[model samples]
Target: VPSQKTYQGSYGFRLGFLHSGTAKSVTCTYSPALNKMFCQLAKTCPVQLWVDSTPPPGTRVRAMAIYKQSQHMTEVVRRCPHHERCSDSDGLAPPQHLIRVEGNLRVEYLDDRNTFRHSVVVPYEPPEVGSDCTTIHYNYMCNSSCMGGMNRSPILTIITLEDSSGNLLGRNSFEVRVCACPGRDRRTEEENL
Candidate 1:
């Protein structure tokens, strides 16, 4: 039965603009889950997610902008189309069904923050397309446009976990640090809770 061990091959997963804090990004598929802009880059871009302590599969698109400076999962209130944005999928859904979920966008997030029951879904790349270690072009400096002078303080990326509905799955925050002494916008710091 030695071949039984060989039946499965070991693999690793790797991304584009946004990222999740911790926990193996074991889900998050690649099927048309990216922006038209990101799709251009994704075309040029996976494999096994995890065998142990694996996470649930995701298949929705809920991109949310986050708050600045404040580091706490309790504070992820989906606001605008700002600098730091996270893309997640519907934590769970029907089988063989692809839901192009807007994820309760265009609405306020006060309801999500009010109730402790959040719809937070972990962040993962469209494994069917790109990855966590995915590539980024020039202006992809976590911004809509890359035309600006020396920016001020570092940026705080808010990774809000959402279900297919407008539910707050949970909160995963990130830090787009500035490099002056020893640090790094895409150069992010994951504050895992």
Candidate 2:
């Protein structure tokens, strides 16, 4: 069990055990720009975890139970906008120029009952643009501390991007909940023996 850390925000840090395995076996990345939890497991397995954030620290959110994997991997294809091969003689590369921008990201979570539960604000910064394309990074997390059970309520996570002056720009929302995958449990009683 990990100790809880007090955060500047209204909520505390929530860390749950993921049952160590391959990188693909578990993922917990949260992207504010995309407003997605992006939590995917390679295979379904039993999960037992203790959340040390809220609702009585160091308490189990739910009993040891099996959860089926419901997420599938998707392929992302990238291509040049010009749809033409790059020229090597003159050092002309494909269209890869990009502008870097910075802003603020605000994330809020609401319960199914339409009540605000949690929120966090993060900064959006991009890598310096020199020649080619640069990457922009924005991170946020909305951990419904200890909100796990078969009858748990559905929650919605909302993300908003704003400029330095707090001007609203773009917003997206995602519904989140704990659910078991379909089909069979991957582990058997014999495996524990």
Candidate 3:
């Protein structure tokens, strides 16, 4: 079933957002229950989403977006587009799904101070057309955009996991980082967490 937020209900999961300029993203998680697929991008936001597919709901268009900041299981609505902006296959649709999602754009985010953080996730991955683009992989990188240009390392993982209703179940796990720093040893900080 799709997650629903209520005062007493603890079923629906909370989704976070990672901005790349004005662009929004979310982490991709796999679930075995729904049997569909889900991507972690905004389901509803102020920004616009553009899909380059045949007609509107063709069978070839299956693009997904995820938040690159916090390793959550959902997306930020205020910062992204509506649900299944790409597909209505099972209701687990993402905000933006492109054939080649490799490009630049701006995204808005609220930082620790409740202030909007405008950052960029470089080396955009162009949407993979058919199976040829599926082989492409994204890993860690440094984000030296602004603000003392601090080296931030955030993992951005893209995995295959979804339920029949496109709901991302809590089962598998992977790592894909964004806003990385140069020469920062993650092992050294493992003790801190």
Candidate 4:
């Protein structure tokens, strides 16, 4: 399901999602046990998410905002609408001011910090809508470190989309958990035990 959140003085809102899909011909199913959305077209087709957020208060109808869910994910910022003082979606932001997402976003975690140091932009490419698709399944793995923390490491993935002109389009957020950073040699330490 899609969700949203905001800050007190912030003029822009944050939109998030846990899942996505594409156009195709196939049977879709949702499993309560897995809390997952399954479909064939959803497999081959690309995923594109739209972003939208409320503006802050006042005659000023536009403001700036950033989208970030985890330390590993890239942080995206754009100009959006101002709440109380805004008129409509048009009152959001300008054109070409914010970055437009081309396709789905993914993250590959490395043992080194450099993997999480830089930001990589994945082009967003939407698939054509159609029918007559087949059934399929898919999965992947995320490598999280466990260096020295209380429990599991936290990670988040975020995406923000906008029009040619910078305006609040839509944003998505997905939470991830990894082992942790520079994990400790728990096995060796437990040898004594």
Candidate 5:
């Protein structure tokens, strides 16, 4: 629930969740300057937080997880574009999220000391994951590729939050896609055989 907030008439300050239309997950954005696509760092900044409180507030990651996709997807969409990866149809395949990014990261956040609480913007890379494949042709003949489930499938990174003295707050998560798109139950063109 990262899409809610309200103004104040008597309230000194209050913390708000994420922004509206905030997709639960995020995808790599193309950098025209670099001519590269990268899965960037993502976050849900706590808005209107009482950063400048009596003694100042703080945060820590109570729990954390970083699920990584085991394989690597084709890089350089122009050289081996996503459209060309699957030749049978312009359909997307389900991402196989199998790996988890390893190591311990001391998840910490800094406050702006005024209005917001700077939370963790989890880090990851596209090179850590790759697209899937099948025999004879790399994931072709996609009879099962659907309008809804395919595209921008993500490996998940989830975390639980806590206050300065270790009071449990809420959970937060961000999803990263090897592909450039994410999905919901959207529709597509009709066809037969």
Candidate 6:
């Protein structure tokens, strides 16, 4: 297990083990966001995890499984958005969970060190006349404690432009859970999603 860290906002993490040649499995989550423990499973031979709702700490967990290779090797675990009273508990249950499932595949779990890690509070400035209203924005400089592996630069360039109202124009987003250092070997961009 990784070093224990407390994440009180909206997510919790869990790991499941497969016994024998089991392919499919179900796990329950005690999500603080929902306050209910729900079930999810791997539908086929191999699967990836997709977390629906975020989880909190100190949640009870259980796993049950059934595996079949000929089935569609995909995991479609949906999350419950609303909170419900636990049948095991009254109204005192903390919250339910969103479950993610993965089986028979190479998997890695990394923490998100980039959430609000870069605070770019650009003052609302009006755009210049017909200057594409666009400019390049360099990502925040990540220190020695970079998120992922090295070689691929962690620098993310955002092609951003401002609207006439001084609001950010267009969809501007970048994922930071996986990025690499610059001036090294080639890196593959992988979305844990």
Q: State candidate 6's TM-score.
A: 0.21
Clashing pairs in 2: 68-181
Model 4 residue 8 lDDT score: 22
lDDT digits (tens) for residues 3-112 of candidate 5: 11222213222222222221335432322222222232221122122322222235433212232333422211111133335433212221221111223243223322
RMSD of each: 15.0, 20.8, 15.5, 16.7, 18.0, 22.9
Error of 1 at 155 (Å): 1.2
Best by lDDT: 4
Overlapping backbone residue pairs in candidate 6 total: 14
lDDT of 1 by residue, 86-146 (tens): 3432333211111112232322222243542222222333333333231211111232222
TM-score for each model: 0.27, 0.29, 0.23, 0.29, 0.24, 0.21
- What C-alpha lDDT does candidate 2 achieve relative to the native structure? 0.25
Lowest-sum lDDT 10-residue window in model 4: 134-143
Reference-based lDDT, residue 33, model 5? 28
Candidate 4 local lDDT, 1-193, one digit each (tens): 1123322223232332223322233233222233223332112212223212333221111212223334423432211222212232222222312211222233111122442231223322222255222111211112222223322323333334433353434454433221122112222223335
RMSD in angstroms, candidate 6?
Answer: 22.9
User: Candidate 5 — which pairs collide?
Assistant: 71-129, 71-130, 72-129, 72-130, 72-131, 73-130, 73-131, 134-139, 152-181
Query: Quick one: how many clashes does candidate 3 have?
Result: 50
Better of 2 and 5 by lDDT: 5
Q: Which residue runs of candidate 4 sit more than 4 Å off their true CA positions?
A: 1-117, 131-144, 149-152, 163-168, 178-193
Give per-candidate clash totals.
19, 1, 50, 37, 9, 14
Give a tens-digit lDDT track for model 3, residues 114-156: 4222222222122355521212222111111223322232322
